[PDB]
Amino acid sequence: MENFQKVEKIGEGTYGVVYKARNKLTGEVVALKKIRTEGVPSTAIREISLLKELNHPNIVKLLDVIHTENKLYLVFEFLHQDLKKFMDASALTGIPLPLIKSYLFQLLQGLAFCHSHRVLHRDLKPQNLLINTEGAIKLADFGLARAFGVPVRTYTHEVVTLWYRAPEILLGCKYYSTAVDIWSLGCIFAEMVTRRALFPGDSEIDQLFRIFRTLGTPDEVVWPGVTSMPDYKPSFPKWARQDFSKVVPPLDEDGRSLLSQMLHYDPNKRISAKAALAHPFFQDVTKPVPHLRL
Ligand SMILES: CC(C)(C)Nc1nc(C(F)(F)F)nc2ccc(-c3cccc(N)c3)cc12
Numbered sequence: 074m075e076n077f078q079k080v081e082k083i084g085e086g087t088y089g090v091v092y093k094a095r096n097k098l099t100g101e102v103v104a105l106k107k108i109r110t111e112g113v114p115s116t117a118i119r120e121i122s123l124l125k126e127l128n129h130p131n132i133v134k135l136l137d138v139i140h141t142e143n144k145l146y147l148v149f150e151f152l153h154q155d156l157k158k159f160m161d162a163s164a165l166t167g168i169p170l171p172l173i174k175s176y177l178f179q180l181l182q183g184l185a186f187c188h189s190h191r192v193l194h195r196d197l198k199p200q201n202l203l204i205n206t207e208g209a210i211k212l213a214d215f216g217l218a219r220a221f222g223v224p225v226r227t228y229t230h231e232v233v234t235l236w237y238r239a240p241e242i243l244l245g246c247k248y249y250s251t252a253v254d255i256w257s258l259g260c261i262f263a264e265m266v267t268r269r270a271l272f273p274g275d276s277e278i279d280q281l282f283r284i285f286r287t288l289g290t291p292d293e294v295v296w297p298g299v300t301s302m303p304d305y306k307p308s309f310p311k312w313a314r315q316d317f318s319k320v321v322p323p324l325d326e327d328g329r330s331l332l333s334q335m336l337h338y339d340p341n342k343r344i345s346a347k348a349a350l351a352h353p354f355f356q357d358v359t360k361p362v363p364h365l366r367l
Contacts (some may be wrong), residue, residue: 074139074146077105087196087227088217093151099209103136104152104208108145108221109228119146120220127192131183133203133211151269152203152211153367156261158203167361172361173265174354176202180258183212185346188251192216195249196223197257198237199264208362236260236270240291241340243281245303255349259335263321271320278284282310288336291316296338327354 076097085091085108094105124135139146156176160168168176180202187194196218204210225233239256241249263271272287274280285291290311291299299305317329324332331354337343344352 074141077103079105085227085229085231086214087224087233088221089228094148102151104149106147106149108147113140113143113145117145117220120216121145122251124216127187127190127216129183129186131179131211132187132215133213149213152205154204154365155200156202156210157173157199159363160199160265160268167268168265169361171359172363173262174358175208176276176356177258177262178350178358180208180212181346181349182259184254185350187215188254188346191251193219193251194254195219196233197254197261198234198259202261204363206363206365206367208360235274235277236272238280239340240284240338241282241302243277244299244305250340252343253347255335255343259332260337262332266321266324285309286312287315287320288338291338299338312333327352330354
């Protein structure tokens with residue numbers, strides 16, 4: 074597009090590159106995503122257009138959609154970094170606990186807002202949570218995820234990650250719920266306290282068996298229905314559930330209560346965003362600022 078000085082490339086999305094740009098109309102700085110090519114479908118457009126009205130402090134704002142002859146451009150507010158890089162920088166340290174539960178609390182607000190309008194994200198992961206220098210964190214690629222996608226390669230042939238994918242999706246359910254995003258957020262929570270990914274699978278069945286080694290192989294008592302799932306196999310090994318105080322040391326007890334409720338197998342039993350926001354863990358939630366290099 075012509076009203077946009079492209080300043081810097083700042084990434085490979087699942088759908089396209091992202092540039093930092095200046096809007097030469099308004100003088101604003103912007104993240105410009107440039108998606109696909111021919112010929113982009115009606116339904117993608119109609120869906121994505123109306124994301125312009127899904128606004129909240131913790132969703133990154135979608136400023137405009139441009140469809141031109143024949144790519145899609147999405148232009149977003151600009152945030153200076155993502156969670157994965159901040160975790161890598163905080164490696165010897167760990168993000169402080171106050172800042173962990175601040176971020177978790179904000180994401181959990183952003184999620185409750187989306188789920189009250191029945192939109193799922195469904196591909197939540199550290200690199201599409203975006204942070205600023207004032208201490209906010211925001212959900213990016215909301216609704217894109219399942220307007221186009223999710224491919225197992227991106228447009229760069231990059232493998233998309235499995236690490237945060239809920240088990241009902243791995244077991245081949247078509248009609249999953251907002252509980253999907255709660256599973257993912259819980260994996261990310263554990264990765265912040267431990268500084269290590271919780272379930273770093275490198276295929277679907279590896280991913281799936283890594284969950285089983287830690288939470289036990291699921292059955293009909295803990296999850297009614299499991300046994301009927303498309304990709305369930307009688308022949309799955311049966312591991313026993315691990316004691317939860319070694320999975321996420323040294324979270325305190327309120328942190329492990331919350332985590333395990335976000336990681337229940339049965340997606341009807343795991344906790345909602347709304348309900349999570351009432352959990353005792355957030356009794357003393359602060360608002361830390363990351364101070365940050367930029
Ligand atoms: C597509 C993907 C979600 C992977 N990434 C990003 N998407 C968008 C958005 F606004 F276009 F969504 N804006 C972004 C803004 C900044 C960054 C960014 C910039 C510098 C360092 C790191 N680690 C991430 C990544 C972004």
